[PDB]
Design a protein around this ligand. Structure first.
Ligand SMILES: *[C@@H]1O[C@H](CO)[C@@H](O[C@@H]2O[C@H](CO)[C@@H](O[C@@H]3O[C@H](CO[C@H]4O[C@H](CO)[C@@H](O)[C@H](O)[C@@H]4O)[C@@H](O)[C@H](O[C@H]4O[C@H](CO)[C@@H](O)[C@H](O)[C@@H]4O[C@H]4O[C@H](CO)[C@@H](O)[C@H](O)[C@@H]4O[C@H]4O[C@H](CO)[C@@H](O)[C@H](O)[C@@H]4O)[C@@H]3O)[C@H](O)[C@H]2NC(C)=O)[C@H](O)[C@H]1NC(C)=O
Ligand SMILES: *[C@@H]1O[C@H](CO)[C@@H](O[C@@H]2O[C@H](CO)[C@@H](O[C@@H]3O[C@H](CO[C@H]4O[C@H](CO)[C@@H](O)[C@H](O)[C@@H]4O)[C@@H](O)[C@H](O[C@H]4O[C@H](CO)[C@@H](O)[C@H](O)[C@@H]4O[C@H]4O[C@H](CO)[C@@H](O)[C@H](O)[C@@H]4O[C@H]4O[C@H](CO)[C@@H](O)[C@H](O)[C@@H]4O)[C@@H]3O)[C@H](O)[C@H]2NC(C)=O)[C@H](O)[C@H]1NC(C)=O
Ligand SMILES: *[C@@H]1O[C@H](CO)[C@@H](O[C@@H]2O[C@H](CO)[C@@H](O[C@@H]3O[C@H](CO[C@H]4O[C@H](CO)[C@@H](O)[C@H](O)[C@@H]4O)[C@@H](O)[C@H](O[C@H]4O[C@H](CO)[C@@H](O)[C@H](O)[C@@H]4O[C@H]4O[C@H](CO)[C@@H](O)[C@H](O)[C@@H]4O[C@H]4O[C@H](CO)[C@@H](O)[C@H](O)[C@@H]4O)[C@@H]3O)[C@H](O)[C@H]2NC(C)=O)[C@H](O)[C@H]1NC(C)=O
Ligand SMILES: *[C@@H]1O[C@H](CO)[C@@H](O[C@@H]2O[C@H](CO)[C@@H](O[C@@H]3O[C@H](CO[C@H]4O[C@H](CO)[C@@H](O)[C@H](O)[C@@H]4O)[C@@H](O)[C@H](O[C@H]4O[C@H](CO)[C@@H](O)[C@H](O)[C@@H]4O[C@H]4O[C@H](CO)[C@@H](O)[C@H](O)[C@@H]4O[C@H]4O[C@H](CO)[C@@H](O)[C@H](O)[C@@H]4O)[C@@H]3O)[C@H](O)[C@H]2NC(C)=O)[C@H](O)[C@H]1NC(C)=O
Ligand SMILES: *[C@@H]1O[C@H](CO)[C@@H](O[C@@H]2O[C@H](CO)[C@@H](O)[C@H](O)[C@H]2NC(C)=O)[C@H](O)[C@H]1NC(C)=O
Ligand SMILES: *[C@@H]1O[C@H](CO)[C@@H](O[C@@H]2O[C@H](CO)[C@@H](O)[C@H](O)[C@H]2NC(C)=O)[C@H](O)[C@H]1NC(C)=O
Ligand SMILES: *[C@@H]1O[C@H](CO)[C@@H](O[C@@H]2O[C@H](CO)[C@@H](O)[C@H](O)[C@H]2NC(C)=O)[C@H](O)[C@H]1NC(C)=O
Ligand SMILES: *[C@@H]1O[C@H](CO)[C@@H](O[C@@H]2O[C@H](CO)[C@@H](O)[C@H](O)[C@H]2NC(C)=O)[C@H](O)[C@H]1NC(C)=O
Ligand SMILES: CCCN(C)C(=O)[C@@H]1OC(C(=O)O)=C[C@H](NC(=N)N)[C@H]1NC(C)=O
Ligand SMILES: CCCN(C)C(=O)[C@@H]1OC(C(=O)O)=C[C@H](NC(=N)N)[C@H]1NC(C)=O
Ligand SMILES: [Ca+2]
Ligand SMILES: [Ca+2]
Ligand SMILES: [Ca+2]
Ligand SMILES: [Ca+2]
Lengths: 388, 388, 388, 388
């Protein structure tokens, strides 16, 4: 109809309720489920769906062998109905590639897939299910993007890309697209020293992205975008409650404009909702691996370098595998505020579970409640032994 | 379009004709059919569908082992086309949880799923396929609901929940929702001493629910709701034709305001159509187990403590497994009256058939006919030996 | 929109072109295809679909054992997209039962399914996908109907039923339905001595049905219905080109008002297009079994007791299995005339191929061409050995 | 809405970006994927889809044995969602046959399938999913057509057919259809000596077809059609960059009106975009077999007998199997020009890989970019060893 405008602020997050869960690995042990990774969720005005990067093979299929690898010509961005698993028969291919993002602007959806060899990748921007724009690699070193939904305001949908090293300074760009066409792009500015896999959400005409500093930071970089002025700023979450993985133990004081040191060249895509006292941070429980997942209310985490938790909710037990996590919201729901939501990728198989030769995942997702709801843990649920 | 109003009375029930049957277990022996239990049927203005609580695994899959358990993080309310089986590929997830209800108000559908650990469950009310309201457990002991469709009148859809003990007094509440929001809730009143899994239907602006007294009664409790005044009453079916399971043998006189004794802490979800002489009761044939199923016309069963059958129809032979049963009607059919319908859950596997390690079911459903139709029996039809 | 009226006459049939073929048995050897029999084809104003009586199990499934049987509680009328096979995942259940008919009146579709034990069957008439009318058995001996599409005119859709003996006189009735309700019914009249499984088509406000006299006739009975006056007549195809199976060898002169003798208590559902010189008869090639299939142009077959073929087209070689055949036409196609179409059921398995324990079929269908097209034969195509 | 008119010219082709890839063989190793060959792509105003000739069996099924054969009664033209594989459950049958073409005219789609024995084949032209016209073989020797999409202009959709010898002169005809009806047909004229499997595209009210001279030419014949005047011309691509397979090595000067000699009675369906300096030719890398695939910019290839490449892009490595290739464009995209697209059939199995008994393929497709994008190679990706 008309382009959606981020006119509402976030609802008060007093807890998280269960939103969707596909139990993909459990079900796929005996049905035609595609092997995936790097999942996310994204809404259209009339439907919300699960998204991920297929590996072009079923879990039980013999081609599942070797799916620990990230980039191949057999990957594609696929979407499927909320809480169903990604099967061969219900999965819709949005585009071909090994890194993606996608978002609805209110009128139609823009999906972006990057493919190519390491030194010669290219992004192709689809709008209304047709290819419209193509961007060639600028640093010739794995052009890559969010791995979660982008956000639009009045037709303008900013997207963060990175090209270059994962263990040194790289070239991050913020592209402002409208109907799949490039209106403008900027180089990253601010104090964030390295940007990877941004998780974004929008409220009151501002887009907040919590990304990942693979190079040096255990605290997360944040990019705040003005989609009207088409400008942005960057910094790090000030809080001592560190949210990358692996990471050192929490200090008593964090860093606002520098990476918090202790772990180099590693991390995991993650997210946060930064809204004054209504601030909640997601993170793996383990400081060593992608294990467990919890949400912590840390009032003013973005700007207060001594902020610590005032409330929390466990999502996945530390005795269960987690993985990537990101933000999304249903911008087309009823009500006066946007309900914060997130998903957690539950990785199974390699490298942690190496008795099998594949790597896949299932999805669990939650949204906020103004109630103070009791908590449950939500594991993948599959028994690896069955796959042997 | 507009909210549906219960303006019609029930059609005269002279017999029952076959409405739907999915043969899920038979078919699932060699196809991707989800393991389920606690099924029901519910209509939208343009389609009627089968509903149930998936176990997040196929019947043939290795994860089917252990599906006798009621509550896990792998369950979800799913719906699928009438008479098809619940497959991985055609099942639509309505919400995540291990206890549910769902009903269309004429404009859109409300679905409710409760999830959580025993002492910390929570309900989330979805409307128009979006989460709108959340209710936290009030007694910290398995918050639970109908397991069959709710009913709406002018946008108001009452739902009965219970939280607390299954073998003592508990806290039952009647919530009146409109567009997924709570307009009001009451504690249970009347003479019903324990309420569980209510089966409801609406006619002439009144909603009748035949539930289950797990604690003491072999006769069924009944809750009659006024959706306009948002008030209700409760009692027991007076008739000596006892309809819970297990149960004692039928006496010559029943009880109108107290549970009829003889069996404690057990039962099965069931239903009835209470309409003066046009009254029909459903029940298992066996007084000891979920075996067989028959419909009995017992004129004035609700108010006459000596009422006995004047007609009957066998639905499932006593040599076949039955299970849960509930009511639903197509409130959007043509004609001057609402045609009473019901379903019977045909449970296969554990605990009765323990050579297999799973528990699932298929569905058979009937609706009333003004004709006096010949009868057939409708068993699940699967051979357990094939699964070995 | 509006009720369809049979305002056109048939197109000139100079040959038959391929219309649809599902290769169900071939495909089902390694995919989830339901076991069926008694198939047909029927069109809606915007789509034409394949129909059949499912056996409630896949071909490869263990429950396929015993599917030679005709009537069980696991059968249902299902429809699926033209030329696809009937799979567990794309098959839509129209109603439950072991004998059926279905037709679109221009506004919506009426489907009829009969179920029950032999001495207590009942038909339930569905309209707009809802049950509207029920008819109880009148002779208590396998109430049964067409097994192919009915035809409508201005909302009136006549249907032929038979109840009683298959090897003696029985009680055949012609019901005139409108919006699923009974406007009227007549007993069969005319000279046809036994009626079973009528195949019908409509043109110029008249409905012609070529049925089967199981009891005595090797020539086929014909019922011509006036859907406006709601009256009919009956006789036999006069031609010596006999079209039932099994049957004696063709004589030089046939019978117009009596069954042509030589074979008792047996036959196969079949059809014909009776249109003066534009007359074409379908029949198995073998006079002994359901083997082969050919179309023969026999000018004035209905009224000329010495009529013989003037042209022909082989559909299935005599070295291939055939089975039931019936008529249908797309009453919503463009043009000035109705294009005659038909299907042939290609039965595989029992009783002819008894190395397997199942009985199923695939479908081949043709429509007429005003051209004189070259001919091909169209067998099922499956290798039974593969199923062993 | 209205008939589409070829009002735009082609966009400038500076490179090719990835458009779609189904990884059918990889996925089909463990899921219900139909065996196919002779694929293509074609767009409707609201969706673009993959098309191919099914073999009426899954790859893993036992009936896959023998699928190297081209024509059987078990083949059919099927279409399915872009980039999904052709499965039993998502494939839509357009018509029955072993040679086809299909195109949308802006209002609805016309699909053509030819079936029959070698000496008695016939084409049936479907429009709006209904059979409208039939054409009988004229030379009684494998009536055949494009194997890729046709193109329409103001309702007129020209189609090229050939009937007769594949190793001598044959009878090629250009049919001009409108709403499935024949407006006119011509015999082939011009200098092309043999025509087979034309690949066509339209721009600025002209339709260009790059076909295949099976008999003598290693250079490709080209037919340019005027859909308004309903006339055409024919010649060969003048360029020395030879594009058939097998073929001799490239000379320094090609032939404009005669087949370039060196290889007789063999070839492969292929295509080209002939647009002055904006000219790009596709071809297998190997001069001996269907191996590899590359796109070469050869300015003025059609008219310049000494034209050589000025740029290029590898699509499939010479160490990977290729096969048929053809053109299509989304005539309903936004923008001022038509974006040239093409697909490459990646054949697996027989005759090159004879350890398996089947022959199938997957699809890769690209469209043009005005950017100068980095290149990747796109192989089928399946491991034949897995199928053993
Ligand atoms: C039914 O449901 C309800 C609803 O969920 C249940 O109630 C919930 O219970 C939760 C668990 O207790 C509770 O969650 C905790 O909240 C704490 C904050 O509240 C307390 O402090 C505030 C502020 O003073 C008070 O207002 C309030 O009254 C409380 O006293 C959080 O602080 C908790 O998180 C910390 O502990 C958990 C382990 O429980 C860690 O995993 C987590 O990371 C936090 O601790 C680490 O990080 C901090 C900050 O740097 C460190 O100081 C600390 O030492 C830890 O550091 C180590 O571990 C991390 C992670 O591994 C590592 O990185 C680091 O290096 C160190 O090694 C926790 O979030 C809910 O708030 C509460 N909800 C409500 C509404 O009440 C109820 O119990 C359920 N009922 C039943 C019967 O079960
Ligand atoms: C073709 O189709 C038609 C249509 O279906 C067939 O006709 C139907 O036939 C049915 C079976 O006969 C018949 O059903 C019965 O109806 C009885 C009522 O009708 C009779 O009584 C009235 C009132 O006097 C008369 O008007 C009428 O003329 C009849 O005489 C019911 O009473 C029957 O139910 C009871 O019996 C069945 C077993 O048949 C039990 O399973 C059932 O539970 C009922 O009996 C128990 O409960 C009562 C009440 O408390 C006890 O008194 C009794 O002892 C039983 O108690 C024991 O068992 C229960 C259950 O296990 C246990 O809990 C308890 O503790 C005890 O142990 C039955 O419903 C249809 O009405 C009739 N329909 C029509 C339209 O005619 C026709 O036969 C078919 N044709 C062919 C050829 O087959
Ligand atoms: C390319 O395609 C075209 C198009 O299809 C091919 O041409 C077609 O060729 C067909 C086969 O020849 C042909 O079909 C036959 O048509 C005959 C009628 O035409 C002839 O007679 C008329 C009338 O005189 C002439 O005008 C005309 O010129 C011809 O001379 C039919 O009579 C044929 O059917 C009979 O024979 C077949 C076997 O071929 C039987 O299966 C069939 O049942 C018919 O015969 C039985 O029944 C009759 C009637 O009672 C008996 O008299 C006779 O003895 C048979 O009876 C026995 O068998 C039956 C069945 O088993 C049994 O019940 C009974 O008891 C007995 O045991 C046949 O239909 C097409 O018309 C023709 N089409 C066109 C447009 O030309 C062309 O050949 C193909 N090209 C190539 C290269 O292959
Ligand atoms: C990142 O991405 C970019 C973008 O893709 C990469 O850059 C691309 O690199 C490509 C590979 O180098 C390049 O493709 C080549 O383009 C050549 C034309 O450009 C050159 O010539 C022009 C004209 O002078 C100059 O303007 C320009 O500056 C260049 O110098 C083509 O000529 C190439 O094709 C020929 O070679 C390939 C092998 O590479 C053959 O397979 C192909 O068939 C062509 O050669 C055969 O045919 C010709 C013509 O008849 C014969 O003369 C020749 O001998 C060959 O003949 C034999 O082989 C054939 C086929 O088997 C057989 O039939 C025959 O009988 C003989 O046996 C090639 O197309 C892109 O244009 C370039 N793109 C851009 C935008 O720059 C970049 O490298 C990537 N980066 C990294 C780090 O990898
Ligand atoms: C989001 O904001 C823009 C205004 O920036 C709205 O766009 C106006 O919409 C009306 C109706 O479409 C037009 O007549 C105005 O000219 C539009 N645009 C501009 C850019 O001025 C848009 O409608 C808003 N979206 C919603 C859902 O309200
Ligand atoms: C059910 O009853 C309510 C009246 O209680 C009907 O609601 C009225 O509908 C008309 C048209 O929508 C409005 O103009 C009235 O104001 C509506 N409501 C009220 C609450 O007064 C409703 O239309 C009835 N439903 C149907 C199907 O007739
Ligand atoms: C089939 O015939 C009936 C007439 O018998 C047509 O019905 C008339 O349709 C118009 C528009 O719906 C009404 O105003 C007339 O009263 C209708 N009916 C009768 C029974 O008189 C019907 O429209 C015809 N169908 C078609 C497709 O033309
Ligand atoms: C393609 O061209 C034809 C003109 O040749 C357009 O057809 C005209 O369309 C308008 C509206 O439908 C009619 O009133 C004219 O009579 C139409 N036709 C002719 C043949 O004169 C057609 O609309 C054009 N297509 C598009 C998409 O613009
Ligand atoms: C305190 C529980 C009382 N109660 C109603 C039961 O135990 C019911 O028993 C039965 C049962 O089949 O008897 C299954 C139900 N299972 C299910 N809905 N998943 C279960 N309810 C819950 C919520 O687990
Ligand atoms: C008294 C029965 C006479 N009759 C028409 C038959 O026996 C038909 O025979 C055949 C048959 O293939 O010959 C199958 C039919 N099977 C089927 N429609 N399920 C069956 N009809 C019924 C209703 O069972
Ligand atoms: Ca890091
Ligand atoms: Ca009880
Ligand atoms: Ca007979
Ligand atoms: Ca050649």
């Amino acid at each position: 109809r008309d382009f959606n405008n981020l006119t509402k602020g976030l609802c008060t997050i007093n807890s998280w309720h269960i939103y969707g869960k596909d139990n993909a690995v459990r079900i796929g042990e005996d049905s035609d489920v595609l092997v995936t990774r790097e999942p996310y969720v994204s809404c259209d005005p009339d439907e919300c769906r699960f998204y991920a990067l297929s590996q072009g093979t079923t879990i039980r299929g013999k081609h599942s062998n070797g799916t620990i690898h990230d980039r191949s010509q057999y990957r594609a961005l696929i979407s499927w109905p909320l809480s169903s698993p990604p099967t061969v028969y219900n999965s819709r291919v949005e585009c071909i590639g090994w890194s993606s993002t996608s978002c609805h602007d209110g009128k139609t959806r823009m999906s972006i897939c990057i493919s190519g060899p390491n030194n010669n990748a290219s992004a192709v921007i689809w709008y209304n299910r047709r290819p419209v724009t193509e961007i060639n690699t600028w640093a010739r070193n794995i052009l890559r993007t969010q791995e979660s939904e982008c956000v639009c305001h009045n037709g303008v949908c900013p997207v963060v890309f990175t090209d270059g090293s994962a263990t040194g300074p790289a070239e991050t760009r913020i592209y402002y697209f409208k109907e799949g066409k490039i209106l403008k792009w900027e180089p990253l500015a601010g104090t964030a020293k390295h940007i990877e896999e941004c998780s974004c959400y929008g409220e009151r005409a501002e887009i907040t992205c919590t990304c990942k500093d693979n190079w040096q930071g255990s605290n997360r970089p944040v990019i705040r975008i003005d989609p009207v002025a088409m400008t942005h700023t960057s910094q790090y979450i000030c809080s001592p409650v560190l949210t990358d993985n692996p990471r050192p133990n929490d200090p008593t004081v964090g860093k606002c404009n520098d990476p918090y040191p202790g772990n180099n060249n590693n991390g995991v895509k993650g997210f946060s909702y930064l809204d004054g006292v209504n601030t909640w941070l997601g993170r793996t429980i383990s400081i060593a691996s992608r294990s467990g997942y919890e949400m912590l209310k840390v009032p003013n985490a973005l700007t207060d370098d001594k902020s610590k938790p005032t409330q929390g909710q466990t999502i996945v037990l530390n005795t269960d595998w987690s993985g990537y996590s990101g933000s999304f919201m249903d911008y087309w729901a009823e009500g006066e505020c946007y309900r914060a939501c997130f998903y957690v990728e539950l990785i199974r198989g390699r490298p942690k579970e190496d008795k099998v030769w594949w790597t896949s995942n299932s999805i669990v997702s939650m949204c906020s409640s103004t109630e103070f709801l009791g908590q449950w843990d939500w594991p993948d649920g599959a028994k690896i032994e069955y796959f042997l």
